[PDB]
Structure 1
Amino acid sequence: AYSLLSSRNRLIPRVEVQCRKREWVKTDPDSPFLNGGREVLYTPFTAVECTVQPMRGKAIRDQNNQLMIGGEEDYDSYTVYSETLLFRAREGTEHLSDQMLLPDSGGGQTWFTVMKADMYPSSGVPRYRYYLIAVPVGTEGG
Structure 2
Amino acid sequence: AYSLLSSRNRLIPRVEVQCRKREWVKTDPDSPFLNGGREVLYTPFTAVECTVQPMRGKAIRDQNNQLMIGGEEDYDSYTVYSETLLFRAREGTEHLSDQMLLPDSGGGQTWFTVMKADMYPSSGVPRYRYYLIAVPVGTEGG
Scaled by the length of structure 2, the TM-score of the pair is 1.00
Match of 2:23 in 1: 23
Query: Segments of 4+ in structure 1 off by > 3 A?
Result: none
**Unpaired runs of at least 5, structure 2:** none
Question: Identity of counterpart residues, as a percentage?
Answer: 100
Within 2, Cα distance between the matches of 1:18 and 1:106?
Answer: 19
Match of 1:132 in 2: 132
Within 2, Cα distance between the matches of 1:106 and 1:16?
Answer: 21
Within 1, Cα distance between the matches of 2:127 and 2:91?
Answer: 25
Q: CA deviation at 1:67?
A: 0.0
Q: CA deviation at 1:57?
A: 0.0
- How well do the aligned residues superpose, as a CA RMSD in angstroms? 0.0
Q: CA deviation at 1:16?
A: 0.0
Once the two structures are superposed, the pairs formed by residues 2-17 of structure 1 within 5 Å of their partners are 2-17=2-17
For the residue of structure 1 that corresponds to 2:33, the secondary structure is coil
Within 2, Cα distance between the matches of 1:57 and 1:85?
Answer: 27
Could you report, residue by residue, the CA deviation over 1:45-77 in whole angstroms, capped at 9, with x for unpaired residues? 000000000000000000000000000000000
For the residue of structure 1 that corresponds to 2:129, the secondary structure is strand
Within 1, Cα distance between the matches of 2:62 and 2:93?
Answer: 32
Within 2, Cα distance between the matches of 1:35 and 1:104?
Answer: 32
**Unpaired runs of at least 5, structure 1:** none
Q: CA deviation at 1:90?
A: 0.0
Within 1, Cα distance between the matches of 2:121 and 2:44?
Answer: 27
Aligned residues: 142
Scaled by the length of structure 1, the TM-score of the pair is 1.00
Once the two structures are superposed, the pairs formed by residues 28-107 of structure 1 within 5 Å of their partners are 28-107=28-107
For the residue of structure 1 that corresponds to 2:61, the secondary structure is helix
Q: CA deviation at 1:19?
A: 0.0
For the residue of structure 1 that corresponds to 2:25, the secondary structure is coil
